[PDB]
Amino acid sequence: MESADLRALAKHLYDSYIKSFPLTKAKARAILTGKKSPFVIYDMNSLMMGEDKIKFKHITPKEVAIRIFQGCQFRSVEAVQEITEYAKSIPGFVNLDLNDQVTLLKYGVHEIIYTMLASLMNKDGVLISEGQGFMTREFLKSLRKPFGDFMEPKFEFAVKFNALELDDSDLAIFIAVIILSGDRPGLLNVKPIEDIQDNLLQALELQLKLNHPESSQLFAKLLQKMTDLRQIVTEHVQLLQVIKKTETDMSLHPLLQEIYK
Amino acid sequence: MESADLRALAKHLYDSYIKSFPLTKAKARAILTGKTTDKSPFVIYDMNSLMMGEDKISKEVAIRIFQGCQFRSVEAVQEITEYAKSIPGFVNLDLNDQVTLLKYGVHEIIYTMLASLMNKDGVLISEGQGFMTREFLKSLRKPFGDFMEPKFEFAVKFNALELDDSDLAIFIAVIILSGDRPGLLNVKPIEDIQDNLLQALELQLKLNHPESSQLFAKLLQKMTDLRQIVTEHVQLLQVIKKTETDMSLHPLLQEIYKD
Numbered sequence A: 001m002e003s004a005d006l007r008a009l010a011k012h013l014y015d016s017y018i019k020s021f022p023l024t025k026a027k028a029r030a031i032l033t034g035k036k037s038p039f040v041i042y043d044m045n046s047l048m049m050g051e052d053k054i055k056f057k058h059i060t061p062k063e064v065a066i067r068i069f070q071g072c073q074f075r076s077v078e079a080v081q082e083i084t085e086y087a088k089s090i091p092g093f094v095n096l097d098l099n100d101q102v103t104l105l106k107y108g109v110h111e112i113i114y115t116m117l118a119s120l121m122n123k124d125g126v127l128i129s130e131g132q133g134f135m136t137r138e139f140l141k142s143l144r145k146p147f148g149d150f151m152e153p154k155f156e157f158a159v160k161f162n163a164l165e166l167d168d169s170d171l172a173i174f175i176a177v178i179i180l181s182g183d184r185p186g187l188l189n190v191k192p193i194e195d196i197q198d199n200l201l202q203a204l205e206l207q208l209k210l211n212h213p214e215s216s217q218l219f220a221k222l223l224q225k226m227t228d229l230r231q232i233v234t235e236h237v238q239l240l241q242v243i244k245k246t247e248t249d250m251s252l253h254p255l256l257q258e259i260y261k
Numbered sequence B: 001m002e003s004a005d006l007r008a009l010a011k012h013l014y015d016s017y018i019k020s021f022p023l024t025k026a027k028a029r030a031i032l033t034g035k036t037t038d039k040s041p042f043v044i045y046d047m048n049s050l051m052m053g054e055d056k057i058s059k060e061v062a063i064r065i066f067q068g069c070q071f072r073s074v075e076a077v078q079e080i081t082e083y084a085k086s087i088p089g090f091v092n093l094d095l096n097d098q099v100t101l102l103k104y105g106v107h108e109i110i111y112t113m114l115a116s117l118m119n120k121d122g123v124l125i126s127e128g129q130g131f132m133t134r135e136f137l138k139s140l141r142k143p144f145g146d147f148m149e150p151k152f153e154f155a156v157k158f159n160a161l162e163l164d165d166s167d168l169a170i171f172i173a174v175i176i177l178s179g180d181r182p183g184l185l186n187v188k189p190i191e192d193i194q195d196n197l198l199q200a201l202e203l204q205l206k207l208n209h210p211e212s213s214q215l216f217a218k219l220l221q222k223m224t225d226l227r228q229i230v231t232e233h234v235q236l237l238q239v240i241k242k243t244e245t246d247m248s249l250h251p252l253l254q255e256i257y258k259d
């Protein structure tokens, strides 16, 4: 690929990433650093007021720890549709076999949700409802039973990931790289997937050298984070199963259970 | 680092890798592909060929084989430790960090270098004098059968990269100098060394595999496969520990897996 084509691919992905995702990293950092302050949820009473004054669609209709956990699950489903739409803009993606498109999205969304959640996090908490709200790390970590220990690993990853100081133009290509992973189980035609990922990796490499020229070997270090992502996604799955087999108070309307399966 | 300094570091690391590891990938491939009469391995594919293999190269066969693997893993830890001492900057690090880097790194390197000894049909043993088939290992009883197969699965994919020893020497160094190991005290001096090693690996792969597009990225993505298999392995050991109460591990290995 020629250098100018890689920059074209990078710019294409950045524009689509801006249209697909409501709250960008650039805007999220402005809210987090305090540079219209978000409503802060730091305890039980502040949560109760936030749902009454603001309409947090994922924290309304039970026990608080379960409602918060389910709220994270409800937002994760919304993000899946945003990731799906963004994937359609990746050159070559919609031309892949239809089952392979579904397979790539099925096994990639968790890694991408974790990646993009870091954009909304700092060491003290996480933005919610398109940056209108802020839930503290301490409030999430203090939820009872396994729900508290379910939340903290996300902040631990995000803090490490955010030290790379990626911006949105870096992240748009990186997320594209994750989607086009040829090692997903059940892929039928790996070759066009790895061919697209090779273009995306070239575009990411050049993007990082031009956008972070003093950040030595940032490309390599970002690729090493794909290990952290896979590891934490597998831990995540094992934490859910434990919650599922233990907790008798998790029942939603069956139609809801289907949607948010 | 300048280009000539990166080439110097690659040659340094390849030199130490030859001095540290008795069975290289180059020699392993010459034995496996055959076409020679002086380095043909004896092939162990069932009980009878195993029994004859012991004369040519106590307890239940699956246990004896597992013990064979653990004994060679200990030797591998010894060879890996010796190579690590040669990586510029490693011995100058805080001593607790040296232990920590080796604790979490040796297994990822064992799996990497075990692939050199593998093809889809089996694995070289006893310094390449023997060859134990994949089917025979898979057919062991209890948990031991499924204990063997995940290694072959990784190797088939890893070997498709067609790395040679000079490539692997730098890659193995990159793995050891990982700043994200749990419990490290001084992450910065470790990451500075890894940066030079990553630069050296990058230049090495471009010169040695110029048609292999993005091989650098693809090789780094393999560190994900490595991390996963080490995790599966540790969980398989635990099942064996609670099932086989009369089976001991080497002290060096038991220290490595604790936490």
Ligand SMILES: O=C(O)c1ccc(-c2nn(C(=O)c3c(Cl)cccc3C(F)(F)F)c3cc(Cl)ccc23)c(OCc2ccccc2)c1
Pocket: A058, A059, A068, A069, A071, A072, A073, A074, A075, A076, A079, A110, A113, A114, A116, A117, A120, A126, A127, A128, A129, A135, A140, A150, A151, A152, A154, A155
């Ligand atoms: O806006 C967005 O892009 C957004 C994106 C993600 C969350 C998110 N999800 N997540 C999870 O566990 C989770 C993750 Cl990482 C991956 C897959 C599935 C899950 C699932 F399914 F298990 F949920 C959180 C855990 C923590 Cl600690 C904090 C946030 C999340 C998100 O949370 C907003 C939120 C926070 C609190 C209460 C209600 C909503 C927002």
Ligand SMILES: O=C(O)c1ccc(-c2nn(C(=O)c3c(Cl)cccc3C(F)(F)F)c3cc(Cl)ccc23)c(OCc2ccccc2)c1
Pocket: B065, B066, B067, B068, B069, B070, B071, B072, B073, B076, B107, B110, B111, B113, B114, B117, B123, B124, B125, B126, B132, B137, B147, B148, B149, B151, B253
């Ligand atoms: O030459 C070398 O560098 C070499 C290096 C490794 C083995 C190795 N070990 N290993 C294990 O399980 C194992 C591993 Cl990976 C790490 C730590 C502890 C263990 C323990 F404790 F579980 F054993 C194998 C499983 C399979 Cl399937 C194939 C190979 C290994 C190796 O095996 C050669 C061999 C095979 C059969 C009989 C005798 C020797 C060689």
